[PDB]
Curated annotation (Swiss-Prot):
Residues modified as Phosphothreonine: 13, 249
EC number: 2.7.11.24
Protein name: Mitogen-activated protein kinase 14
Organism the protein comes from: Homo sapiens
Subunit text: Component of a signaling complex containing at least AKAP13, PKN1, MAPK14, ZAK and MAP2K3. Within this complex, AKAP13 interacts directly with PKN1, which in turn recruits MAPK14, MAP2K3 and ZAK. Binds to a kinase interaction motif within the protein tyrosine phosphatase, PTPRR. This interaction retains MAPK14 in the cytoplasm and prevents nuclear accumulation. Interacts with SPAG9 and GADD45A. Interacts with CDC25B, CDC25C, DUSP1, DUSP10, DUSP16, NP60, SUPT20H and TAB1. Interacts with casein kinase II subunits CSNK2A1 and CSNK2B. Interacts with PPM1D.
One GO CC annotation: cytoplasm
Cofactor needs: Mg(2+)
Gene: MAPK14
One of the protein's GO biological processes: positive regulation of myoblast fusion
Assigned protein family: Belongs to the protein kinase superfamily. CMGC Ser/Thr protein kinase family. MAP kinase subfamily.
Domain notes: The TXY motif contains the threonine and tyrosine residues whose phosphorylation activates the MAP kinases.
Length: 338
């Protein structure tokens, strides 16, 4: 049942992959490992193959490898990066040292389709719809992305979009204010804040909150969404955090209609619901998909949710060989998608 593997050196690393993956071509590398483009002769698909670096070097590396693999195996949605294949040239656990991950080759992210231009309202609808459809699924697995930005959104020529965690082979511009401040209780709508920032930028052709630094970022945010009202302040536990809010100059929320000039009034309404300062009042991914702005794309019967995602491993402190063994189990149990 094991396919025939072949060796090949690139960039200065011995790749050992099953024969089905042909014409390996390095696309990039980093501290995580290396990625090659390949042709999958089994499927006729152009795939990316990633060889992890130092997957089991330490307890932390091993747990990270297991984390990454477990998550990828669980993410099964059109708008979220998933797994076509996972393999190892190892024939046993004792042999097991390398992990390779396989996914659809992606050639572009949101930045390089947009090219910092105004997109049409129809195009924005389609892109934002997809992000939110992916987010609904992600959030239903009780996961928060936390790092949504244009570089974490892969987009093909047909503007079909997938959410990434790591980009292709600043961030503060899309971060929710509660993360910018050190408010130690955030919800999934931190990702909705990010989506609103992305949406605004797609519509306007300009970064919504291009802060120069941490402080500037919050200044820019608060100028638009206002300083915390009395309802929000009542939910802030630390005196000094409230002291920090009050010390800074008090400004009203701007009317987004007087900000996003010429935009579809439904786009403006949705942005208002995404960019509420109080995260308790921020629209969810599922509620946003039902918003009238998405009427041409919304299908309540094809916006699926994820299976329950068991994240209990996160609280465990195990030895390297235990994490390695658990990862090995996940490699061998992988069933390709249909
Ligand atoms: C930075 C860490 C990365 N990991 C992957 C990856 C590869 C295989 C499997 C999985 C789960 C992730 C990446 C990936 C996935 C799919 N496509 C790409 N493609 C590219 O990076 C790319 C860039 C320019 C031109 C052509 C291709 C990268 S990037």
């Amino acid at each position: 049942e094991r396919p025939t593997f072949y060796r090949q050196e690139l960039n200065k690393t011995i790749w050992e992959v099953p024969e089905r993956y042909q014409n390996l071509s390095p696309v990039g590398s980093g501290a995580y490992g290396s990625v090659c483009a390949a042709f999958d002769t089994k499927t006729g698909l152009r795939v990316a193959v990633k060889k992890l670096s130092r997957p089991f070097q330490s307890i932390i590396h091993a747990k990270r490898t297991y984390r990454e693999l477990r998550l990828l195996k669980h993410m099964k949605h059109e708008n979220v990066i998933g797994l076509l294949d996972v393999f190892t040239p190892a024939r046993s656990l004792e042999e097991f040292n390398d992990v390779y991950l396989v996914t659809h080759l992606m050639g572009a992210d949101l930045n390089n389709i947009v090219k910092s231009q105004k997109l049409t309202d129809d195009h924005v609808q389609f892109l934002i719809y997809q992000i939110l459809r992916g987010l609904k699924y992600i959030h239903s697995a009780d996961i928060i992305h936390r790092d949504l930005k244009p570089s974490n959104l892969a987009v093909n020529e047909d503007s079909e979009l997938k959410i990434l965690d790591f980009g292709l082979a600043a961030t503060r511009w899309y971060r929710a204010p509660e993360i910018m401040l050190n408010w130690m209780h955030y919800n999934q709508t931190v990702d909705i804040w990010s989506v609103g920032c992305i949406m605004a930028e797609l519509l306007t052709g300009r970064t919504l909150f291009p802060g120069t630094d941490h402080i500037d970022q919050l200044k820019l945010i608060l100028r638009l969404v206002g300083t915390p009202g009395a309802e929000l302040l009542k939910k802030i536990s630390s005196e000094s955090a409230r002291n920090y809010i009050q010390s800074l100059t008090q400004m009203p929320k701007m009317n987004f209609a007087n900000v996003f000039i010429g935009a579809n009034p439904l786009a403006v309404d949705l942005l208002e619901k995404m960019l509420v300062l109080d995260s308790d009042k921020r629209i969810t991914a599922a509620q946003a998909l039902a918003h009238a702005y998405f009427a041409q794309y919304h299908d309540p019967d094809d916006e699926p949710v994820a299976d329950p995602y068991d994240q209990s491993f996160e609280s465990r402190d195990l030895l390297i060989d235990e994490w390695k063994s658990l990862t090995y189990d996940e490699v061998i149990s992988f069933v390709p998608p249909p």
